[PDB]
Every structure is written in C-alpha cells, then in structure tokens.
Amino acid sequence: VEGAVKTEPVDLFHPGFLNSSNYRIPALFKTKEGTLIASIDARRHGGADAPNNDIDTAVRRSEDGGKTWDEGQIIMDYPDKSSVIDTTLIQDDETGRIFLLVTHFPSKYGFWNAGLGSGFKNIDGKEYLCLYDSSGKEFTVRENVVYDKDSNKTEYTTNALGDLFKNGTKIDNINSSTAPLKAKGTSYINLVYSDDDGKTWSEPQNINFQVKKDWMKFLGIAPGRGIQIKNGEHKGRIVVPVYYTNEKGKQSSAVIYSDDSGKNWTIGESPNDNRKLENGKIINSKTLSDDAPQLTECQVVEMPNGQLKLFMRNLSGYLNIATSFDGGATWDETVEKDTNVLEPYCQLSVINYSQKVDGKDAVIFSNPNARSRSNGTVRIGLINQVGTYENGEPKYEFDWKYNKLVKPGYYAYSCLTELSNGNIGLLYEGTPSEEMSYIEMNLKYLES
Ligand SMILES: *[C@]1(C(=O)O)O[C@@H]([C@H](O)[C@H](O)CO)[C@H](NC(C)=O)[C@@H](O)[C@H]1F
Ligand SMILES: [Ca+2]
Ligand SMILES: [Ca+2]
C-alpha cells in the first residue's frame, strides 16, 4: 500500500564474511544510544550444531539505523571445536552496560551429551571450576591458579578464555581435545559486556556456578534478546530467557535474572514447575519424563503492570505462553496454547512495542507460520485485559490483529527490534546456514 516500507533484504552475514563459511542464530538489539547491534554464530565448518563444528561469536554494529553496518568482529573464539553457540543481547539502562550471553561447550560436547551439573565445586565456601587430568583426578581453579585434590598449588594457571599456562607459558586450553587438564564436558553460560555501546567487549564470565543446578544437564541461552523490567517492584531487573534439560534429557524453559546490574544472576522456576497440564496432571521440570510437555527456547515480554509473558517453543504445534506475577521467579500453573499461531518447533522472537496501536499496548512477533520452517510471518499482537485470575491479578490476552508474510520459502530463527524511527528491524534465517537477512518494515506495511 501507499507509504508501506519493507526494505529489500540485505545479507548482514553470509559465507565469506569474517572468513566464516556459515552463519546461524540471529540476535538484534537497539541500544540506548540508538545503535543496532547484531550478533550471530560464525559457524566455521558447516552449519551443524555443536559438537560437530567450531563456532565463534560475531557482532556487527550500525550507527545510522541499520542503513549501513561496520566490518564486524569476532568477540569469542575457543580452539579446537570448542564452540560458543546461541547469543542473546540486553542492556542495563541505568549503567549503559550492554550484555551478550551465549552457551559454551568444551570440544566434543553439545546439547545432547552435556554432562550433569555446573562444572564447579564448593571448597571452603566458594565455587571453583573443576579440571580433570588423564587419570580423572580432580583439580580446582582458585583465582586462576590450579590446585590439586589435596589443595596444593600446581604449576598451572588459567585465564577467562580457558588458556592453560604452565609456569606462565601457554601450553593448551582447558576446552580443547588435547589439554592435560580439561573442564567438565557440559554446557556453560558465558557473559560478556560492553561499556562503549558495543565497540569493545569484555572477556567471558562463566556464570554457571550462579545459575546451573546439579540436576541440569544442558542449560543454555535461548537466543535473541532479554528485557529489563519497566514497571512495578521488579523495575530494573534484567531478564534473560534460557532453557535446560533434566537428568532424563527433557527440556524446560526458564529465565535467569539479575537485580544488581548483571553482577549476580539467579535462575527462576520453569513454567514446567508445578505446571497443571490440560486435564489436571501436575509435573515439574526436575522429574519431567515425557516429550509432550517440553518447553524449550523462549522469549519474554512485559505487560503494562509488570507481569511477564514467556513465549515458548514447544511440541504442541502452536505457540505456548506462560505468565509470571513475580518478575520471572515462578509462573502460573497454566501454560496457554494459542491456536492462532502455528509453532513448527523453532525459535521465535517477540518484543514489546513502544507506541500504542489502535489504542492498545502491543507486541511484535516473528516466527515461521507453518508446520515447517517456512512462511516467515510478522504479527502485531494487541494486549487486552480480560478480567482477572482467581488470585486477583490481571489476566492479559493477545489479539493477533495484524499478520504479514515477510519471507516466502525458508524461514527459521529470527530476531526483532524496534528502531529509533518506530519501524521494526528483523534479522532472520532465510537460508539454513548461509545468508542471514536484515529488513526494515513500517507499521503501514505490517498492517496492510
Ligand atoms: C536450534 C535449531 O533447532 O535449529 O536448536 C538448538 C537446540 O539444538 C535445540 O533447541 C535442542 O532441542 C540449537 N542450540 C544448541 C545449543 O544445540 C540452536 O543453535 C539451533 F540449532
Ligand atoms: Ca573457534
Ligand atoms: Ca508453577
């Protein structure tokens, strides 16, 4: 229609960019300064997930609203088929600090073979990363100095990247397939941060000891973005979607969050914890033994009063939505199924939109509207309160009033952002693992 804007796709990542043959897993965010940051997996050996690859994290920035982008940089790169996989972006408005979190695996590990627990051990009241030698003896890293099982200092030290130094000389890396001391083979949550609007990034902080329980096998970032709560008593809380497997391998969503500007993180309960299934069975994420109720990658948005809604990949064929009244610490027992929104078992993106649409608060949603990763569709969901829960909290529901096909053919993972001009930016997998496409759309287009 007249005045509709949908830009022609640009390949923001593609084979050869930064000398990476493949790319997957978009994250896209507009900073407080108005800069766009796009992060992605630079999959170096093909498109496959860990452990069958060597994956680094790449970032591009735009200072002109997505019209032009910088030359990119690799910000995390582990050796020898140790991979960082699945990024997410969020910023603390108070401090201006931008966070990027990602899942990390040592060489040979990935989602399906991750070992149990955090990979840390408590010694005398502090958690220390464990290392193992060829005989299986256990060592700890205490302030980057390696101690043996009898608390004798060894000749080894580490750094935040896992480099392993013998008397100060680098000899290997604890994440490789060859090191004399290796980390536990499991997932780790890494966090890096930027205080200069994404130009430079810290080295990784391994926060597994704060967020990963002893019964979780995988715990990973659910890629895309986080939020910082705007309304109510949890205002300022930084909320990052995640998901994990239990000892039986079954997946449940949750969020990690920080009330102290990213210094410390905690994991909330899953919506699968004390979840009441359709006909009344009660499950929990620690004991879940069936495939059907699994809840996996997810993204979160905030309601007008501060209530959270967690939108989740799942096995029902349709979108599932959980509700939290306590800032992501727990969820209502009922997970809603929205049969207006097909969900083919793929990541989705949902964001708050800053302006009213048709007099209502709104969200913007992106996923493949199909029974496969195709027919990429962007929706505007209007929020309406429809009475209250038994506990008196407002009950909010979405009206998917506007729905627009933006990508015929292949469409997999995606990430939205609102732009400074009020339009919507979208970075999406329009190929399995090669070109990642960026478009800008206005509301007139989305409503057409
Ligand atoms: C997606 C994908 O489906 O395309 O899957 C994730 C997991 O394999 C899946 O959620 C497991 O049930 C990948 N992440 C990891 C850590 O394997 C994503 O990178 C992506 F591959
Ligand atoms: Ca690498
Ligand atoms: Ca619950």
Cis preceding-peptide flag for 51 (omega within 30 of 0): yes
Residue nearest to atom 3 of ligand 1 (CA): 346
265 is in an annotated binding site: no
The 3-state DSSP class for residue 385 equals: strand
Provide the residue type at 418 as one letter: E
Question: Which residue's CA is the closest to the ligand 1 atom numbered 2?
Answer: 346
Q: Is 172 in the pocket of ligand 1 (CB under 6 A)?
A: no
Residue 312, token pair as written in the block = 């989740």
> What is the atom index within ligand 1 of the atom nearest the CA of 220?
16
Nearest in space to 233 (alpha carbons), one of 335, 310, 308, 298? 308
Q: How many angstroms from the chain centroid is the CA of residue 399?
A: 26
Decide: 86 in ligand 1 pocket, CB within 6 A.
yes
Q: 27, 51 in Cβ contact below 8 A? A: no
Could you tell me the resolution of this structure in angstroms?
Answer: 1.2
- What single string gives the DSSP state of each residue in 13-35? E-TTGGG-SEEEEEEEEE-TTS-
By alpha-carbon position, which residue is closest to atom 7 of ligand 1?
A: 111
Q: Which ligand is nearest to the CA of 107?
A: 2
Name the one residue in this structure whose structure tokens are 């408005």: 93
Which of 30, 204, 228 has the alpha carbon at shortest distance from 103?
204
Please compute Rg for the chain using Cα positions.
22
Q: How would DSSP label each residue in 85-105?
A: EEEEEEEETTTTEEEEEEEEE
| Helices and strands: H and E segment counts in the chain | 2, 36
Query: With a 6 A CB cut-off, is 425 part of the ligand 1 pocket?
Result: no
Do the annotations mark residue 148 as ligand-binding? Answer: no
Domains and CATH numbers, the chain: 1-118+185-448 (2.120.10.10), 119-184 (2.40.220.10)
Other C-beta atoms lying within 10 Å of the C-beta of residue 245: 24
Question: What letter represents residue 403's amino acid?
Answer: N
Phi, psi of 182 (to 5 degrees): -130, 145
Nearest atom of ligand 1 to the alpha carbon of 41: 19
Q: Catalytic residues, which ones?
A: 49, 297
Tell me if 218 CB under 6 Å of ligand 1: no
Contacts of 48 (CB under 8 A, 6+ apart): none
- CA 372 to chain CA mean position, Å: 22
Q: How far is the CA of 49 from the centre of ligand 1 (A)?
A: 7
Using a CB cutoff of 5 Å, list residues around ligand 2, an ion.
Answer: 54, 56, 77
Determine whether the shortest distance from the Cβ of 103 to ligand 1 is under 6 A. Answer: yes
User: Is any ligand 1 atom within 6 A of the Cβ of residue 429?
Assistant: no
User: Which residues, 6 or more positions from 125, have their beta carbon under 8 angstroms from its beta carbon?
Assistant: none
Residues in the chain, overall count: 448
Round to the nearest angstrom and report the end-to-end CA distance of the chain.
7
Phi/psi-derived region of residue 447, left when phi > 0, alpha when psi is between -120 and 50, beta in every other case: alpha
CA–CA gap between residue 346 and residue 328 (Å, rounded): 22
